[PDB]
């Protein structure tokens, strides 16, 4: 599907991921998988209650993520065109 393909477009792009646990991990994306589980680098972490920390590397299971924010530029990415 296109939504996961787009995630590949995100790769190497500062992206923000919100977990279903309520946290927020904003940082660079090292790797992604069709499962959608995403691992980040230099992520700035926001706990559900707002406490913010900084973690060198991270991996998050795909099932957990509520939504992903990807670079605005991606929007005109080549694959998207219908025809």
């Amino acid at each position: 599907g296109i939504p996961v393909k787009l995630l590949n477009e995100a790769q190497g792009h500062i992206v923000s991921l919100e977990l279903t646990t309520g946290a927020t991990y904003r940082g660079k994306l090292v790797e992604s998988e069709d499962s959608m589980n995403v691992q980040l680098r230099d992520v700035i972490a926001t706990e559900p209650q707002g406490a913010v920390t900084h973690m060198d590397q991270i991996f998050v299971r795909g099932s957990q993520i509520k939504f992903i924010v990807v670079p605005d530029l991606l929007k005109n990415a080549p694959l998207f065109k219908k025809n």
Partner: protein
């Protein structure tokens, strides 16, 4: 279908949060396609670092369904 890529991490001490509240940090030996992760020298982290921490076992395996996120503390 596809195996998750943990390949760089293996042999590194890793903290990971399991299911509702629990955080477990241990050396990681094995991973599978469901993300089931087996790590040795497991320790259950708590508020008081030396005190409420208790080790689990010599080898512990984790269902991939209870993993929320994985962070490796190390290189």
């Amino acid at each position: 279908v596809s195996t998750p890529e943990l390949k760089k991490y293996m042999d590194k001490k890793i903290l990971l949060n399991i299911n509702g509240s629990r955080k477990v940090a241990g050396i990681l030996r094995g991973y599978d396609i469901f993300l089931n992760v087996v790590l040795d020298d497991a320790m259950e982290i708590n508020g008081e670092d030396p005190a409420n921490n208790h080790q689990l076992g010599l080898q512990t395996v984790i269902r991939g369904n209870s993993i929320i996120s994985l962070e490796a503390l190390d290189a």
